[PDB]
Design an enzyme around this catalytic site. Sequence first.
Site, PDB file in Angstrom:
ATOM      1  N   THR A 106      -2.259  -0.817  -8.645  1.00 19.22           N
ATOM      2  CA  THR A 106      -1.447  -0.408  -7.505  1.00 19.22           C
ATOM      3  C   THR A 106      -1.849  -1.163  -6.242  1.00 19.22           C
ATOM      4  O   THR A 106      -3.034  -1.349  -5.975  1.00 19.22           O
ATOM      5  CB  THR A 106      -1.559   1.107  -7.243  1.00 19.22           C
ATOM      6  N   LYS A 145       7.005   3.559  -5.076  1.00 21.78           N
ATOM      7  CA  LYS A 145       5.847   4.031  -4.331  1.00 21.78           C
ATOM      8  C   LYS A 145       6.061   4.014  -2.825  1.00 21.78           C
ATOM      9  O   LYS A 145       5.114   4.282  -2.077  1.00 21.78           O
ATOM     10  CB  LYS A 145       4.605   3.219  -4.701  1.00 21.78           C
ATOM     11  N   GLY A 159       3.999   5.073   2.157  1.00 24.13           N
ATOM     12  CA  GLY A 159       3.701   4.702   0.790  1.00 24.13           C
ATOM     13  C   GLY A 159       2.498   5.475   0.288  1.00 24.13           C
ATOM     14  O   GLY A 159       1.816   6.163   1.052  1.00 24.13           O
ATOM     15  N   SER A 205      -5.626  -0.663  -5.807  1.00 23.04           N
ATOM     16  CA  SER A 205      -6.597  -1.480  -6.526  1.00 23.04           C
ATOM     17  C   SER A 205      -6.503  -2.948  -6.127  1.00 23.04           C
ATOM     18  O   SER A 205      -7.521  -3.649  -6.091  1.00 23.04           O
ATOM     19  CB  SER A 205      -6.408  -1.311  -8.032  1.00 23.04           C
TER      20      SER A 205
END
EC number: 3.4.25.2
Lengths: 367, 174, 174
Positions: B1, B33, B45, B124
């Site tokens: 993500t 998202k 988000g 990430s």
Amino acid sequence: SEMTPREIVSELDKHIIGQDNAKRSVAIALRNRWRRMQLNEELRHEVTPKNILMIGPTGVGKTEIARRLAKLANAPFIKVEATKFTEKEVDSIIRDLTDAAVKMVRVQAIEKNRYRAPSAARQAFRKKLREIMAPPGMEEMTSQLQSMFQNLLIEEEAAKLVNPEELKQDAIDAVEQHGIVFIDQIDKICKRGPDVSREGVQRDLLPLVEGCTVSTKHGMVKTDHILFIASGAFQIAKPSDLIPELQGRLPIRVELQALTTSDFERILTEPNASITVQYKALMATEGVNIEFTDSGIKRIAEAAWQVNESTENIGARRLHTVLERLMEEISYDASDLSGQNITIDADYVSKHLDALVADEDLSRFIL
Amino acid sequence: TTIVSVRRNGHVVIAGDGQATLGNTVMKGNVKKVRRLYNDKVIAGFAGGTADAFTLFELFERKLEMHQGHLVKAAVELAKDWRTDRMLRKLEALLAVADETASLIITGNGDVVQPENDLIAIGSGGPYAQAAARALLENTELSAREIAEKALDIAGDICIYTNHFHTIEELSYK
Amino acid sequence: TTIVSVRRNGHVVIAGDGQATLGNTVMKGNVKKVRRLYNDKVIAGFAGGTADAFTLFELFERKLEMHQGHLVKAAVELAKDWRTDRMLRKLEALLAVADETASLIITGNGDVVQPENDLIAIGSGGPYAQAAARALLENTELSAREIAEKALDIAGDICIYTNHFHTIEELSYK
Ligand SMILES: Nc1ncnc2c1ncn2[C@@H]1O[C@H](COP(=O)(O)OP(=O)(O)O)[C@@H](O)[C@H]1O
């Protein structure tokens, strides 16, 4: 009263500033009252009051509309906090409404008896003349028992002229026909998802709006045709969170807009007996004459808006705390300033307030 | 993500990928998202569970209504109840939100943070996108939309948890 | 993270870096890890989550109101509640606080400690700064602000988790 909806709003504009949608909504409910009386016997029972739900932030006039409305119709009025019942019986709403209706019709009965309350020597002198201890719930009961035990010229004449059996029967008809109740902060009893105790209050209020009968020491009152005005910010919960039986009993909905700086400028002056006019008459009692410049009124409204944006927005109630903080020096010296004309200019407003408004930590206390 | 936010020339955007990973497998590649809030005046988000963000977004709109849409003060009240409530403390997500005023980050530790240039990069692959967005913002005249778009694609090439499906919500204030 | 406190010549300071590390990446380099408390009469710092400290600092000011601003007694009451409360026990931070009276450290184990010369140095770079501050304090006439500044820069050059972004809050009592 036979006032048309526009005549109602026009009278409300003399006190409330703006918020015309709420003024139009209450005018519709009060006009349906007069419309119902002109209907036949069958429809008068089937038609029920169009109860209103006001929605908006605090201090925008949700209550003043309900107050002036009941004062406009000379109707019995009461305000109740829905949260009070989270911990008193709900039936007390109708009882206190009748006790207010009794004192209302009673002092009005004295008005009819007041004005009722020759030889040359007769006119001459006429010209020269001109223990029982109970828990808190039954404290009102022991009162009546004590008044019964005691039972076993303006006062004697007004008592001789008044009809006590009429005043008690009239106040019931004044409640059953023209009564009004305002339930403040109804949004706080909606489910947050306490929800049992919150929604339990909604169920306890349900019979009052669905048409029920409440006993009172003044008599047996029916809640069928009483008008109700609930209010709430509904920022946390929404009206859809109310129980379905309650949503259907509030056919009229309305949202009151947040007041602007221009509205504060109007509220200070335009409304009849506005707060600025009040202190002008108060300082007139001390022989002082105060006058507010349009720039002074502007910065006062600008000052109240800053405190609401800086920390907490309390609506037009901020105008009260600010104005008293500004006039505190004059109100104290008003005795020694007799015969003087004081002017509240823009410089006077900035002198007494800008030092305070600048410090938010102090504004949370002083203002 | 990976989720990016850039603000430039009276414009601010938020972009995020659509990859949803389950262990070493891809569960769903078109996750949205990014979404709009507070009657289209706010973009936001989230990196984490979908329902955990929907709960925090709804409560964030509540805090905005109490505070008249003030972004910073409502973000503190959200981070205050997030750490406090035993229910909300279980939620695990990284929120990103911005308006015409400023951009900021909200975490489950209750920490509210505004990046140096209002340049948000979370997930990430967040650090990978911040490296690219930092380069373009100082060396190009590209609009905030072009920077967040190109930075998110580079993060998808690098991060195995980020794909190239994109969802953007621009806000123009000028 | 590195935080230093020095007391000299009627002056006391607290300085800290602004680096916030996530794994092997820098998350934010301008974190404000130092702030003032109790109506500007108290200075404090923290090494850990930002909201963990904001929670502990607010309660510490309430302990000062119950104790009329007494630093030591309120620090114990905070350390007592920190270890005791099931919610506060989850907090993970290293607190540093000082006034005109004395300087002391507060920990999540409930241990309240006042270093020998009121010389506090905490964080991953604390021991680095503590040895630089100890050298200047004994071999120079430098003011407490000059010592905490130079010692923090030395810890930033040594600690990988500490940068050279600085925030200081001096208190003069003389
Ligand atoms: N539109 C308005 N016109 C005149 N005065 C107002 C108006 N709105 C608010 N006020 C003033 O502010 C106060 C509003 O309080 P209230 O109406 O009881 O709160 P709420 O509207 O939240 O129920 C009143 O004292 C009233 O004098």
